[PDB]
Structures are given as C-alpha cells and as structure tokens.
Design a protein around this ligand. Structure first.
Ligand SMILES: [Cl-]
Lengths: 199, 199
C-alpha cells in the first residue's frame, strides 16, 4: 500500500504486463497515487496477479496544484500532456496490454481530459475508467467526452459539491475509501476480463 | 476589536446612531464579524465617534456555512432574508441614519444579494458598500446588481480565485487585513461624509 508507483516508467518492454493502470491523484495528495490509488492497485494485483498488472500514478509535470482546479478543464495543460504521454508510453511498450485508468478530484478532471484528447485507437484500449469526486461531473453530464458511458464508472457521492458544479469540499468528498477498495476495482477487473480471452 | 457586534439589534430608537454599519462575515468565521469586521468598525468609530455609528454583524439565520457558497446566489435564502431584515430594522429604528455595508467571501455574496433584493428606497440610503474576496465578482462583473458602481468598492486580489469564477481558496484570499484597516473604511467614511451636511 505505497503511494508512489512507477511500474510503466520502470516497465520492461521485454517483460510486458498484461494490464496497465494509469491513475491521477487529487490536489495536494502524497506520492503519485494519493489516498485512493493504493487501494485500487492492491485489489487489481490480487485479481491479475502482481505481474499481471503495471500500476502507474501520474507524476512528473502533474503537480496536483489546488489552484489548477480553477482552470477551464479542471487541471493544467502540462498535467494533461503528462498523462497523455503515459497512455502513449503504454501503447508503445506494451501494445497488447489492456488499459485501465482513474483519478480522484482534480485527478478525475485530468483523466477525463487526457482521455478526451487521446488518439482514438489508444483510447480504444482503455477497457474501463473509474472517477471519484469528479469535478466536471455536472459540466460533462457524468461522461468522459469521446469515451463510452459503459466504460465509465463515476463515484460521485450525494452531497459531494464538486460533483454538482462547485469546488467546495464537503465531507462526502472525503468518503471514497470504500469505493476504492470495492466497487471501483471490481468494475475495472470486470471490464478487462470481458475484453480478454479466446471467446 | 471584538468579533460580535449587535449595536442595531440592541440599538435604541430614542438614542439613534447617525451611521449604521451592517457587515457579513465569511464562511466558518467567528462571531458575526469574523476577521475583517472589527478592523473596519474600529476605523469607523474613530471617524464618526463611538456613538456616531451602530456596528451590526449579520448573525441569526446566517450560519456562514461553507456548503452554502455552492448555492446559486452564493449563500442561502435564509441568510439573505436575515440581512434584508437588518437593513429594514435600520430603516425603521433610525430613518435618518446613513447606511453602510460590507462582507467578506460568502458575506460579500450575501451583501450583494440582500442589496439586490432591498426596497429601492432603503437601498438609496446605503451610501457605500465594501466587498472582500467577492465570490460573485466574475458572475456580476464587479457590481452589486441594482446598486451604483460609485457606491461600490470591491477588494478582489490578484490570484484570489473566488473573484475570478472559482471557489478555490488561494493565499491572496487570506490577505484582506490591510484593506479592512485602511482603504475600505476610508471609502465608507468618505461616502457617508459626502452625503451628510448642510451643503
Ligand atoms: Cl481547507
């Protein structure tokens, strides 16, 4: 349960993972996974095996700055190109790996924006995306633009004001721990499984 | 420099003040004046004399709740009727008193909304209004609706994101202390003075 994971970056083209998880933390959060990232990762690891999944937090140019929430897409252009780059590194290192993503708060705005901007064929490989305290939930009508609703799972609590057009942080915004341990990883595992196999 | 002032409420119809100051604090702030109210009051007191001015913070149904910032006018309907009532109590107790008002943050949204809704003749008596970290600055284009620009003084710092369409609290939002000690009371004193006198 560590808050910094660089499995894709330190990933080996010759020992490719079969699932790659790219996750963006919320503003001011520790490491590159914050509070929720590790819970999803550990759960993904038991389902795919520790070598079945590369876990990658969005670090680098993503500084998870509080003021950046106030920008038009809910994060910086720099953060967006940092996460777009990670998706592309995944596509390049491991062209057969299934992709999954998520983010919390500014991270959810960051995930939504990067996926909106991604080449449609890399984006085709993202089996599922989870979003918590999605700061653009109202503005995007619960969707990630350019990305199918059935690949999208948004955890937006009742009384989480960021999910209803605000940037006020109320108590439900802080309560996503059990979603990150449970229904979120379950959704990701179940999207990946339904796209792999001989069928 | 006390954070609760009820001079209008505990005001005496038989010993009317000549200036009445009604002030709304920011979210979660102490008393009914918060951090900025006392600085403006003390300054108003030296200029009008301690009996020249009734100082009134907006308490009662105004709970200065953080989540209320997320409502359409930037505060609750209850808060708005609480402050509208105070203006009316002023008009009734002391029909010859000059009126002045202000607010910080949610208090500035509250002041703007109450003044928008006030009877135009009570509103006519508000010589000046000061607003700090005005959460509707962008949405109202630096104005209080229904109220003249030349009666309005908005202290909105560079990099205060609430003044530019957000509810993120950056450091400049916290830096209004010297405005509340200086240029704000000066503006209020100078609006009142220019409307009183035999001329
Ligand atoms: Cl805080």
């Amino acid at each position: 349960g560590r808050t910094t994971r660089d499995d894709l970056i330190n990933g080996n083209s010759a020992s490719c993972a079969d699932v790659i998880f790219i996750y963006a933390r919320g503003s001011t959060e520790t490491g590159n996974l914050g509070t929720l990232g590790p819970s999803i990762a550990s759960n993904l690891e038991s389902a795919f095996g520790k070598d079945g999944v590369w876990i990658q937090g969005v670090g680098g140019a993503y500084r998870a700055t509080l003021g950046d929430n106030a920008l038009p897409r809910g994060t910086s252009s720099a953060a967006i190109r940092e996460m777009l780059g990670l998706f592309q590194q995944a596509n390049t290192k491991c062209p057969d790996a299934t992709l999954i993503a998520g983010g919390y708060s500014q991270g959810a705005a960051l995930a939504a924006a990067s996926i909106e901007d991604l080449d449609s064929a890399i984006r085709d490989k993202i089996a599922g995306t989870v979003l918590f305290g999605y700061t653009k939930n109202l503005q995007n009508r619960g969707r990630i633009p350019n990305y199918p609703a059935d690949r999208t799972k948004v955890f937006c609590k009742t009384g989480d004001l960021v999910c209803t057009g605000s940037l006020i942080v109320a108590a439900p915004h802080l309560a996503y721990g059990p979603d990150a341990r449970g229904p979120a990883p379950e959704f990701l595992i179940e999207k990946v499984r339904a796209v792999r196999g001989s069928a």
